[PDB]
């Protein structure tokens, strides 16, 4: 049938189409998840409006992909999960997005309202389970209110401190029909509001910088979310202050900028008398701004959108509450009427240069060491020389990610996605799929350890199914953080042990991708060149030394 | 060196944790190590506990509750702080829905760093509480034996459920004097309770008055270890019975009194239904029309008093343990002279519907054409299933059709999506079954979608020498295949890869992989996989449009 | 007019809610009306339900659970949206801690206005859930009979607890055809369940071997309506027993086998303790040292299997209903021929310690000097309590000393702060008792601090003609008086008004007020208050430093 010559009603619309039109109206371009009861019509309706749907292999990776796409696009992107266990699997993405202050829209199906209390198929208190992990969580009780709830959730997830929003969609709401003309419209959510700091706070910030003898600027991913790279790069060029990038703050300032103190991080944090926080929290990543990693009398200028975050752990001398791009614009404006810049010759620049040269001399022999099995720094020598300038880099593991953080530079903002503020394993291939869906014209390279790849390695089939040429590089030392000798007979396997002889790259051959196995330093170069030139996804399985480690440091990263 | 003097009067929280777990009968611990639970896993191995490192906490949390169901005592799940606990919330929810015991042990950031934004600091007890029978943080190391005892008892006693113990870093590493730690009692078997005698007699009176009676055997009886009692009751009453999905095995599926081949007719026409440890939830279609008679009479045997009369009123309430109460029914039946007659119109209608459904699927079971349908595939699978095997089913058509084509003869020998209808339990359940029962064959039959939820755990099986048999029925999508995405249009949301070579994942970890497209290959491939001394994967490219047999009603409705 | 044609086919949610509550035995409804629950209370009265409007939702939620405990079925508390439900969270938490049934019915803003910031919009199911056995929102009017039946069943069956139903405005006012409303079954009596016979015999084995046995009668037996079987068990075993605070009355407090006068000695020296519906929580001092023997043996009779062996291991577990299991023990006592011997050293030590404690308080009971101590005041109070009275006790010294000086001879005749130690239950419990048992005297004895929590509810009693007798023991502070502040110093945080004339609050609402400062006034004032046909307040000013009898251990420790 379906003949156009035949009369049709064509005056009604159902909840799935309203959800699709509302999502597209609010800038949702990507939807990751796994279909089934009752959200099959939602994914189909999303495709009719132009929303790109991506079927994953686990809702855990799907929820991670939604927030990564949100951080990259700047607007909340969707995750579609089924009722019951589909939502519980997605709680991983809600908690992770909450800790990173990233937006996210989780759309979870539910059993029909008329069956509540009966023990229906996958009936669950889904709003209650998700509420403590979301900025916004509500159930859409009737289809004609879908435009209201979608605009509500997107605005709550995008405005202020970004967080996750959850919308519960019962099956009878998805399938319920309403008159096309009887549905109330909803306004389109615009750019998140930016606010400014008082003028006396701006001048007090510039005064404190001039009074500092060993100043240090710390650039966090809050500035990347603000798209403040232009303002920050103008601020560092105008002030000539040394800066330190956070893990995912890399790229906002080019990693090869001569004012970076990355190769002297411990000394810079320890000896600085004044610290300028740019969208960065004094949490575990920055060692709480307290001893034994900071001077007891460290002075703090804190720029954060959340007023409650000011003075946490270490008191802030100058508070700058508001948007990063807007406030740094003020600082650049107020600097134009001043002749102060950090002088070109100070003992502080002298000490930073020495510590950078000292740390480079410590890792230099390991970078050149060609003996097999290879160490971490030897592996990254061949990786780094082949990472394009506009690449998007996903990092996951312990030594693989942390050493890769210092060996893989980023010259553009929002081009690094790692374990983040939650220290999460399982974001690897989910972040890569999101990066490959948002920037299909840019290279996507995921560098994971053997343990990290096992959390989401099945998502490699997702990439090959949607033609995503993701370059997965596995650093297999045979365990979690460290290799282990093979157990004697009767001796159980070590709890951290994995499979050092595993051929993870054959998973790529299972889904039409390219697989490469490396055990010798002479194989590494040609194996990476082949995986880069391969028109499709690839896996390079590098068997590294079991005892390999990072260069020694005065303090432990966790302490 | 033993010559050097050493102080030995102190013990930390990880070792007290291991000793308490071993004392309470915890034999298996699944999880992934890392800060701060590494000492817990190491100390557990020192006390003889079997630790099994998984590839995702999601599968680890599913394996723990499966081992708890098989062993009959709460088993452990060890996860790191923060996202390790959040990833394991899947198992807590699934254990809660199935009324299975489970003990989740989650690490936590140091207490003295709370509020500072510590690494993986999280309100873990608050998140897990709505999914647990019991949830509490261990504040001091000297109270570990107390909390482990109370947690295991709360998971095991009464209606079983999940328990959670939060272990901060400072508690794990904190030392205490060994002679000062307060001992804890050992949690015994879950207490059993009986029904009043007039309830037992009223239940037998209702059975004798029924013209079309039906006993429904649920997995509560499998949990209660009541197979001997149920078998005696069915044998002496001659009552027809229907087995729930995981209730299969309590009665052997080849028993002549089974109505499984006429399930829809039995539920719709029965004038009396005897629920043995089974809920009137979605699996039994709520005991209501259009699947049941409006006047259906219910005898309900359940351990939870609040469950009696849900959806459909219960004429006779039997609240208590399934083994003890069926034992009462066997004893009260001795003092009578009744069994359901050997020739009734009810028995003839059941036999006629059974034969009718047999003739409906007979051409599909014999059809050798390629690509094969589901029933043709299971003809070779069922012919090679040992009678003592443990069967893991996962998917939609693969699991549902596998439920009718793969019979069970021992209780607690099928593990499927369960009452939650969960995808992601496949290889986690198989790893659990392979650990608890190393001398028995473990066969997991999954769809191509269900295998992707936990397919990484094949490395866990190969690393621990578990000869798991994974048979993948690949139709190229979720529930149904799909033609190629054409005309520049996107792929269908349910579509996966029909040409995927999942068996190559087995060769990634030293296992054996077999690829089957033709019906002539299925036999030799299954023979080789079963004889291979190690884990194996059989990937079968079935027809994209293959479906189950037509029914009067949809399974969900 | 009746001559006019009217359409009687439709019915709204408020009327359906009323008929469902009446069908499920809800006779009493306490609360405060307003948006949107006004049609609910009016509909309840139209079905014969007694509605009682309180002055605070705190006392309403408390009066509901007390009326439930007194009737044996869940009674209703009706509150408005937002702050009405939050004010009622007090009763939910208290009902959960005491294992008492309760049905809280909370109004809610219209569903079509959710997310808009509607009047008193609140996540009311989410806030109430961690305090209820059952919490759910009624989404459509046609499902009201279903939700009311399931809520009453959840609150009544198993271990009792609180139930919450969320009633949105559009559900209350929404209409549906009567003929299409799905009917609901009537929730019957809570199911009882027996203990296995080998546990019954093992329990009697332990009792025969014990040299110093002690039975403890908890209020779980009073809820089970087991007074007949407990009185038969004690009489035939001739065992010493100890009543818990609200377990008083199950056995008559004047029974010669009571060890109430030697409570501390009986607990510390007993080699076997028989818990009858009593927990080893703070009330029974955890069954642990320094209040019990290290190696004390425990027979524990509880309905909750998870409660067995808490703090102190249970040697013999008796999981099931109190009345039913004690009935088994009485049957098994016939096959035996054992009683605890008439002359044992254990009986001589109990009698000597009872006589010692009476000689320690005898001078205080006899001291006629004014201002009076606690025991002198209770001398005239106890002599004027009818044997069929209902005693409400609240405060610290007032309640604790009143527990030992006001005997109960019938069960479920005493209501006090309970397992939560709540201040604010006084006048709410009294209104509940006066509503449920109008033919019995209701005497409430409160401290000055406890009366301030709910004293405004005296207007409710006068408004409904409840002759509640309120006796205030005013020492001018919380647990202890205070010298008036001097030298410009601030008032003590525990101090109140020692010269307050609380009895004038009774005169504000037509009741009778009496003020007492000397022992010569106490008698005549109590007589005139008991005879006054109406509610009354007797305000007694006691010595600021009056205290309880000294003990070896503090009640809390
Ligand atoms: C918390 C941290 C920000 C702390 O940072 P650090 O590791 O201490 O500093 P890094 O920037 O990583 O650099 C490490 C050291 O290398 C030096 N360094 C940096 N760059 C260079 C270059 N280019 N050349 C030579 N040396 C270099 C730098 O000065 C440091 O030495 P020094 O100056 O001498 O210190 C980070 O470790 C982190 O985010 N880790 C992730 C934790 C996580 O999520 N793990 C996964 C879950 S773990 C499951 O248990
Ligand atoms: C809810 C159910 C218990 C309903 O059971 P049914 O499928 O209706 O009955 P089944 O026992 O499975 O058998 C199906 C039909 O085959 C008949 N049958 C049974 N055994 C046989 C044999 N041996 N031979 C021939 N025919 C048989 C039986 O009488 C039924 O026909 P009729 O008598 O004619 O009916 C079950 O479908 C179920 O639990 N499904 C799991 C749902 C799930 O979790 N899916 C994954 C998530 S789905 C994501 O959206
Ligand atoms: C926790 C308790 C069960 C502990 O019981 P005890 O007070 O120790 O025992 P009681 O039965 O009350 O009796 C106390 C003592 O009086 C003795 N006693 C009892 N009857 C008599 C008679 N008739 N004559 C003489 N002496 C007697 C009894 O043997 C005890 O002495 P000895 O045997 O010599 O010890 C109880 O105190 C309680 O429930 N308190 C409630 C606390 C509360 O909720 N407060 C409100 C919130 S508090 C705000 O901070
Ligand atoms: N638009 C914005 N402008 C300024 N600050 C922001 C903005 N958005 C988020 N932030 C802040 O950035 C902070 C994120 O810091 P964090 O993620 O800990 O940085 P890092 O982990 O890179 O050190 C949050 O406290 C958040 O309040
Ligand atoms: N020892 C026991 N005795 C009796 N019933 C039990 C026991 N343990 C659990 N149960 C009950 O068994 C029921 C399980 O039902 P369900 O999982 O729905 O069965 P199925 O899914 O096999 O139909 C639960 O309601 C639970 O209360
Ligand atoms: N019908 C019943 N039969 C037996 N025990 C019951 C019954 N109903 C409730 N209980 C149990 O009685 C116990 C109440 O003890 P508790 O409130 O501590 O009494 P007390 O305060 O007098 O010591 C609870 O553990 C509850 O599970
Ligand atoms: C969700 C989650 N699970 C587990 C961990 C614990 N742990 C921290 S890093 C890591 C993997 C480290 O090993 P690997 O990925 O192989 O990198 P390597 O250090 O060996 O190079 C894990 C599993 C975690 N942080 N998060
Ligand atoms: C955690 C979870 N996610 C999603 C679903 C939805 N859905 C129901 S069955 C199923 C898989 C069905 O496909 P498959 O495993 O290939 O079996 P098939 O029917 O195709 O043979 C899924 C994903 C679910 N039930 N649980
Ligand atoms: C809801 C609540 N509020 C406060 C308390 C604290 N406190 C315990 S008893 C009590 C009052 C005791 O004093 P009173 O009622 O005057 O009797 P008294 O001991 O003075 O004779 C209070 C307020 C409590 N237990 N519960
Ligand atoms: Cl090179
Ligand atoms: Mg590794
Ligand atoms: Mg499929
Ligand atoms: Mg007082």
Numbering used by the authors:
A (entry chain C): -4 to 554
B (entry chain D), C (entry chain A): -2 to 554
Copy out sentences from the published article reporting this entry, exactly as the authors wrote them:
One such enzyme is 2-hydroxyacyl-CoA lyase/synthase (HACL/S), which catalyzes the reversible cleavage of 2-hydroxyacyl-CoA (2hcCoA) into formyl-CoA (fCoA) and an aldehyde or ketone. All the enzymes are tetramers, specifically dimers of dimers (α2), where α2 dimer represents a catalytical unit. The three domains have specific functions: the N-terminal domain binds the pyrimidine of ThDP (PYR), the middle domain has a regulatory function (R) and binds ADP, and the C-terminal domain binds the pyrophosphoryl group (PP) of ThDP.
In all ApbHACL/S structures, the whole tetramer is in the asymmetric unit. The monomers are structurally very similar to each other, with root mean square deviation (RMSD) on superimposed Cα positions in the range of 0.2–0.4 Å but locally show distinct conformations. A similar intermediate ThDP-hmCoA is also found in the structure of ApbHACL/S-CoA. The structures of ApbHACL/S with CoA and fCoA trapped intermediate states serve as examples. Structures of both TbHACL/S and ApbHACL/S with and without acyl-CoA indicate that there is no notable difference in main chains and side chains except for the well-ordered C-terminal regions.
